Amino acid sequence: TLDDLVRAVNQVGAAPSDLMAILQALKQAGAIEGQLIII
Amino acid sequence: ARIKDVAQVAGVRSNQLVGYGLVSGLPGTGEANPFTEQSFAAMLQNFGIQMPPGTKPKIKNVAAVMVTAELPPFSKPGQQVDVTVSSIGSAKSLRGGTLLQTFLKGLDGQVYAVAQGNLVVSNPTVGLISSGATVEREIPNPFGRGDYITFNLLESDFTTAQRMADAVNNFLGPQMASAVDATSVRVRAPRDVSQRVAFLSAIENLE
Amino acid sequence: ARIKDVAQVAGVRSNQLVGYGLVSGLPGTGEANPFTEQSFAAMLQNFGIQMPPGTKPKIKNVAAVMVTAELPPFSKPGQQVDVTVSSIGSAKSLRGGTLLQTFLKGLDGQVYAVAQGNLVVSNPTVGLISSGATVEREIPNPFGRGDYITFNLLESDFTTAQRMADAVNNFLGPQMASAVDATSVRVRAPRDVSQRVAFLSAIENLE
Amino acid sequence: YITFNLLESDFTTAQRMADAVNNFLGPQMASAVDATSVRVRAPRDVSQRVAFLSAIENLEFDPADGAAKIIVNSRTGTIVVGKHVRLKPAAVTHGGMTVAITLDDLVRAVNQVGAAPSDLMAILQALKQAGAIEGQLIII
Amino acid sequence: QVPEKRQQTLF
Amino acid sequence: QVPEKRQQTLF
Amino acid sequence: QVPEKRQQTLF
Amino acid sequence: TVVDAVEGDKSVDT
Amino acid sequence: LRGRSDPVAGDPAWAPIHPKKKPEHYAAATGSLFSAEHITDLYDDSKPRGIG
Amino acid sequence: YEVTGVATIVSSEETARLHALEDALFKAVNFSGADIGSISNLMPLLEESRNEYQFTNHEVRYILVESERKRRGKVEVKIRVDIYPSATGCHTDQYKKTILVGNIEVASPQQAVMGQIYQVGDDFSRVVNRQLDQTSRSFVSVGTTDYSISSNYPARTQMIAQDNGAQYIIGGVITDLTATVESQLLQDDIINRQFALEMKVFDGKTGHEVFNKAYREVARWPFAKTSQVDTRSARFWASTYGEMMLRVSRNIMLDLESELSCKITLPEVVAVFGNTVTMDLGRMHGVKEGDKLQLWHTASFIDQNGLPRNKVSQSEITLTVSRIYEHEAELTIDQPNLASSVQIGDVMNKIL
Amino acid sequence: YEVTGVATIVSSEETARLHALEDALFKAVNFSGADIGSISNLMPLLEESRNEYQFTNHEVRYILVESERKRRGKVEVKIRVDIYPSATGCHTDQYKKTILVGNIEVASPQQAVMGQIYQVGDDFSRVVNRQLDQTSRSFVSVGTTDYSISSNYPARTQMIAQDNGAQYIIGGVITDLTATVESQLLQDDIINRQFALEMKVFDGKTGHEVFNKAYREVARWPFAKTSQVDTRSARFWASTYGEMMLRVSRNIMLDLESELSCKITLPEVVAVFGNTVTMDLGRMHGVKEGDKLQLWHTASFIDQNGLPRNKVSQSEITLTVSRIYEHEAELTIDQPNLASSVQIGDVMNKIL
Amino acid sequence: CAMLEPIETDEVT
Amino acid sequence: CAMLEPIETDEVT
């Protein structure tokens, strides 16, 4: 799940918190079967 | 290319909601703008704390923002949509903030959603909330009316309009779809709303 | 060369929409111009916050811009078009901004689209939005009227006009197309709008 | 009746969920009224409706793929290209090098010149203007 | 002649 | 002679 | 002798 | 009559 | 004995005209909340432009 | 019969006497059970002030006025008439038509300044709604609406009619509310105020305009020039202007009866449950069990120029009423093999 | 017959008597059922004030005026006439023509300053629309339009006629609203105001101008010089100027009847569904079932100089009416093999 | 005969 | 004969 996305994060320098913004793009594209909750 | 990939159903539209709100819980990266302080004072009056006139709140963890949401078609009360939160004052950053209760108004001036939640910012003055707005009202739709449905091409072209008409006619039968201009294609559809959804499901997947 | 590559259909035109709006969420690269502050105050009054007269907002994340959209032919309500956002005050950059609700007016002074969205800038003072404007009104078209359609050459020439006339006559039959000047070629077309779209689909692909 | 509201609205997902309930229970049991809502007939007793909803909410079905979209985060730089997005072939000249046509080819064209990984967001807009994208370019 | 009140009806 | 009201018509 | 109104004409 | 009620009648020089 | 007629307060010839009520939009026809007669521009100065 | 007609003189004794005669005739026809649709064609032949009236091809043959009095400033007329209530006709075997009263607007708010009667359109559409509901013979009122109905948008008319369940939508514009002043040295000023109105009825099945008429009447404005009059109050509607507006509403109802009553009523299919369909008309509209109905397939298209058009495909399907509710009814399809071709929106007509 | 003619004297007793005689003759012809198109040619031969009139080749033979009175300042004329209603004619077997009332404009706003009657053109086009709708014999009014129709743009005329579904479009310009002052020492000033108008009718099928006429009348302006007159009110239209303008509208209607009534009506093809086509004319236009119609292929071109031209190709196709709606009708093609050559816009004419 | 004169519900007043 | 004199709907007033 995140494992592939974490590797994509680790490819570039970026930051481990850049994954939070990748999910929002996936949510907008309808690529998530679930609920994205921000606490 | 599927029909649903390159076309949209006429009458099945999105709506844009806009509202004003305050973002709290900022690590000292708030504002001191007169409108921010005025809104903060009004909000505090709404909870039973009314400062004497001319009192400067000296707030540093609150920022005034503009909240925007797009209401998808067939949006029902209780659903949640994304909101974009952008600072309009002089706050340095909205990172780590919390959007307080803000009412999102339509183009007719009525409230259709209420937005709260936690901001996720990367530009530090624009953040997003994944389920910030809860839909509170419905917008009527002309989808179930009439004896036909209409497809609007994303990229207008006479040949694409005619080829989509032929695709429907080959699948269903003769004299079923017709291109009325370079953008729109009209397909005859059942009168029952449940049958029209079942009908549109088969048609929107045509290649 | 296809006919559609080197010619355009007469009466099937684009329209230009222009409007004034504010861009928020800028990282401290906004304006302090009097018109920006005046527009900001009016917008805040539209939400229930009215500052006392003579109050300086001290806004730094808001910039006044001019929004322009081109309305493609056969544009239907609910469709989305690109908008170009250009700063008209003294903002240093529009990067990372958000365009607030702006009404796009035609040459007759009526509103035909509403523009919002997120700016994508490379010149830091001009940005683009891929679906900023939502079409809200239709412009009537003379495409389906008359007993003929007309092709207007992108590059005017007597020989190109006559060769396109011969191309249609060879494909369909004698006395079908005629060149009336160096730019226009008239082709007889069916009266039914659906048949004219099917007819124009075959003709616009001629080589 | 009880009504199910789809988290991701789609006509095909609404109809497939209606078929899933009808196959499990029987004919004329669920109906899709729009792209979001599906109505299922339910018992009048509240205890039986909870028992009924328990069996129905666990049904399995395949949601539809949905419309092809390209999501661009203008402030983070990430570009998410969904399934069924097709880019028409074209000659793209960016910087000083020319490339011919998903993102993989365009990313290489970006890497050819120095430029920046965020320069790809502006190449897509040119492709959208030329009609070389079969999908929706959404900027968030 | 007085009008008569409504007769028995079901539903 | 008084004009007569419209007669029965369908659609 | 009064002038006569226009007669029947086609097109 | 030729006199309007709202506006009213608008109608030694020797 | 006066030769003059005093004005009366509330004369219809000088009373204000209440603006006509705009018709309802009926968004169910188009699926949109946009109405050309009901939209409010965020940045307009709101000068007088109609009766009332 | 023994009837009384009461009408106030405004500017001519002839007009007041004619209005009183119309009132007496309307009461006589209502009591006699005769159709009120035929009254609206009798008035033109009543312009003359003859003591005796002769008519042919009507439910009333001879009219003889016996008493004419001007007590309390208004004409009272007592007449005796012979009414023959016909058991037949094109209006007795039809179901009641549901009508929606649309928005009635004042074209010029400037004219409503005197008295500040700006809601006169709404409070008059309320009167028209109640008149159609509780006075008509072949109409049922489904309420009022705030939307304006135009001939340019047949689709909106169809949608609004579907939403309210109305076969016809009636809306108008009030075009004249101005007044003139008549001055006498002996007495005080007389303010005669105008009330002009243009009514328009649209067919909700196809968006067509089926009725169009104009009304204009004049009555005294008894109130002070600077006085504010409330159009919901009894002070407004008990005055001479109010009586005139009530008479105008009655004339609207009689014209609707004259024009639309003998149109064949076409109930619509609401839902289809296998071999049983539901009808939007019920017990309150005149539906009785055992009625036989003929189905028509409805197909109304906007043509290439945007104008509404109608097209019905005839069907071999006949239905009979099985169960009757107050507002709906259940029908059984007599041809089960053809039951699959019935869709929502198809219309039916009662077989005579 | 027994008719009364009422007309106010403006500057000549002869003109008022002639207007009263015209009114009485119009009422007599309307009651007699005779065509009103023929009246407009009878007026020129009525200039003389002879007690007896002799005419040949007309529905009226001899006119004898028996009473002439000047009660209340306006001439009243009572006459007896013999009218022979012909059952035949070129106007009785034709369908009704749909007419759109175009924009009527005031050429010089300077002339409308006195009384501020600037919307006189619009409120007069409304009167013309209602006159054509509810008084004419061979016309149906499809409403008014805000666009101006010119002879320089036949394409725009065709497009507007198609949009409104009108066979003809009628529009005019008001060219004179000036007034003169007649002063007497005994009495007050007399203001005689002018009303000149130039009406123009365009054929919506080809954009041609088919009718062109000019009207000019004079009437007293009873209102004060500084008084503002509302053109929608009854104060304006009940005055002498209003009566003159109403008479002008009636003359417009009679001229339209005189010129366009015997033109063969040409209903248009609205839609083709295989072997069945739809007609833009219906029950309200005089269409009856079983009518036989002949199809004409329409081809109207703008020539090389930009002037409209007409060209119809004759067809071997004959159609019969199968189903009739109030505003449309369905026709069945009698030659199925030729049904493929029918396109939208082809015209038809009823076979006599 | 002799028609009655009983009043009914007022339409507005 | 004797033509009637019944009035009709006003065109504007």
PDB file of N, CA and C in Angstrom, chain J residues 32-55:
ATOM      1  N   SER J  32     -79.278  26.149 -10.390  1.00  0.00           N
ATOM      2  CA  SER J  32     -79.957  25.236 -11.299  1.00  0.00           C
ATOM      3  C   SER J  32     -79.121  24.017 -11.659  1.00  0.00           C
ATOM      4  N   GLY J  33     -77.830  24.015 -11.340  1.00  0.00           N
ATOM      5  CA  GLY J  33     -76.960  22.922 -11.712  1.00  0.00           C
ATOM      6  C   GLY J  33     -76.464  22.970 -13.138  1.00  0.00           C
ATOM      7  N   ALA J  34     -76.867  23.972 -13.912  1.00  0.00           N
ATOM      8  CA  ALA J  34     -76.397  24.107 -15.279  1.00  0.00           C
ATOM      9  C   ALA J  34     -74.911  24.448 -15.297  1.00  0.00           C
ATOM     10  N   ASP J  35     -74.270  24.164 -16.426  1.00  0.00           N
ATOM     11  CA  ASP J  35     -72.846  24.430 -16.543  1.00  0.00           C
ATOM     12  C   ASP J  35     -72.587  25.931 -16.568  1.00  0.00           C
ATOM     13  N   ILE J  36     -71.549  26.352 -15.838  1.00  0.00           N
ATOM     14  CA  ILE J  36     -71.156  27.758 -15.822  1.00  0.00           C
ATOM     15  C   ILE J  36     -70.256  28.120 -16.988  1.00  0.00           C
ATOM     16  N   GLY J  37     -69.827  27.138 -17.781  1.00  0.00           N
ATOM     17  CA  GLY J  37     -69.005  27.442 -18.940  1.00  0.00           C
ATOM     18  C   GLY J  37     -69.757  28.207 -20.011  1.00  0.00           C
ATOM     19  N   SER J  38     -71.058  27.946 -20.144  1.00  0.00           N
ATOM     20  CA  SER J  38     -71.849  28.572 -21.197  1.00  0.00           C
ATOM     21  C   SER J  38     -72.239  30.008 -20.874  1.00  0.00           C
ATOM     22  N   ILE J  39     -72.071  30.448 -19.626  1.00  0.00           N
ATOM     23  CA  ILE J  39     -72.488  31.798 -19.254  1.00  0.00           C
ATOM     24  C   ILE J  39     -71.628  32.839 -19.958  1.00  0.00           C
ATOM     25  N   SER J  40     -70.333  32.560 -20.108  1.00  0.00           N
ATOM     26  CA  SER J  40     -69.399  33.549 -20.634  1.00  0.00           C
ATOM     27  C   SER J  40     -69.684  33.934 -22.079  1.00  0.00           C
ATOM     28  N   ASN J  41     -70.426  33.118 -22.824  1.00  0.00           N
ATOM     29  CA  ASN J  41     -70.836  33.469 -24.174  1.00  0.00           C
ATOM     30  C   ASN J  41     -72.186  34.164 -24.226  1.00  0.00           C
ATOM     31  N   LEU J  42     -72.900  34.239 -23.105  1.00  0.00           N
ATOM     32  CA  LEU J  42     -74.215  34.866 -23.089  1.00  0.00           C
ATOM     33  C   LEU J  42     -74.117  36.367 -22.848  1.00  0.00           C
ATOM     34  N   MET J  43     -73.086  36.805 -22.131  1.00  0.00           N
ATOM     35  CA  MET J  43     -72.888  38.204 -21.768  1.00  0.00           C
ATOM     36  C   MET J  43     -72.840  39.139 -22.975  1.00  0.00           C
ATOM     37  N   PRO J  44     -72.095  38.814 -24.061  1.00  0.00           N
ATOM     38  CA  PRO J  44     -72.057  39.730 -25.210  1.00  0.00           C
ATOM     39  C   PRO J  44     -73.437  40.076 -25.751  1.00  0.00           C
ATOM     40  N   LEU J  45     -74.348  39.106 -25.753  1.00  0.00           N
ATOM     41  CA  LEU J  45     -75.702  39.339 -26.236  1.00  0.00           C
ATOM     42  C   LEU J  45     -76.566  40.008 -25.174  1.00  0.00           C
ATOM     43  N   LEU J  46     -75.952  40.418 -24.061  1.00  0.00           N
ATOM     44  CA  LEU J  46     -76.686  41.107 -23.006  1.00  0.00           C
ATOM     45  C   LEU J  46     -76.330  42.588 -22.929  1.00  0.00           C
ATOM     46  N   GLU J  47     -75.610  43.117 -23.922  1.00  0.00           N
ATOM     47  CA  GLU J  47     -75.243  44.530 -23.897  1.00  0.00           C
ATOM     48  C   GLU J  47     -76.478  45.419 -23.955  1.00  0.00           C
ATOM     49  N   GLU J  48     -77.461  45.042 -24.769  1.00  0.00           N
ATOM     50  CA  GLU J  48     -78.695  45.808 -24.855  1.00  0.00           C
ATOM     51  C   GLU J  48     -79.443  45.767 -23.528  1.00  0.00           C
ATOM     52  N   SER J  49     -80.179  46.841 -23.250  1.00  0.00           N
ATOM     53  CA  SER J  49     -80.954  46.977 -22.019  1.00  0.00           C
ATOM     54  C   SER J  49     -82.416  46.609 -22.227  1.00  0.00           C
ATOM     55  N   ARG J  50     -82.683  45.667 -23.128  1.00  0.00           N
ATOM     56  CA  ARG J  50     -84.051  45.265 -23.417  1.00  0.00           C
ATOM     57  C   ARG J  50     -84.681  44.576 -22.212  1.00  0.00           C
ATOM     58  N   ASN J  51     -85.978  44.815 -22.025  1.00  0.00           N
ATOM     59  CA  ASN J  51     -86.702  44.165 -20.939  1.00  0.00           C
ATOM     60  C   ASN J  51     -86.849  42.666 -21.161  1.00  0.00           C
ATOM     61  N   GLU J  52     -86.778  42.209 -22.409  1.00  0.00           N
ATOM     62  CA  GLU J  52     -86.928  40.801 -22.744  1.00  0.00           C
ATOM     63  C   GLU J  52     -85.769  40.370 -23.628  1.00  0.00           C
ATOM     64  N   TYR J  53     -85.226  39.187 -23.353  1.00  0.00           N
ATOM     65  CA  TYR J  53     -84.117  38.627 -24.114  1.00  0.00           C
ATOM     66  C   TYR J  53     -84.524  37.278 -24.686  1.00  0.00           C
ATOM     67  N   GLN J  54     -84.198  37.051 -25.954  1.00  0.00           N
ATOM     68  CA  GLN J  54     -84.481  35.793 -26.631  1.00  0.00           C
ATOM     69  C   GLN J  54     -83.173  35.161 -27.084  1.00  0.00           C
ATOM     70  N   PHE J  55     -82.985  33.886 -26.748  1.00  0.00           N
ATOM     71  CA  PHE J  55     -81.780  33.153 -27.102  1.00  0.00           C
ATOM     72  C   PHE J  55     -82.153  31.784 -27.650  1.00  0.00           C
TER      73      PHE J  55
END
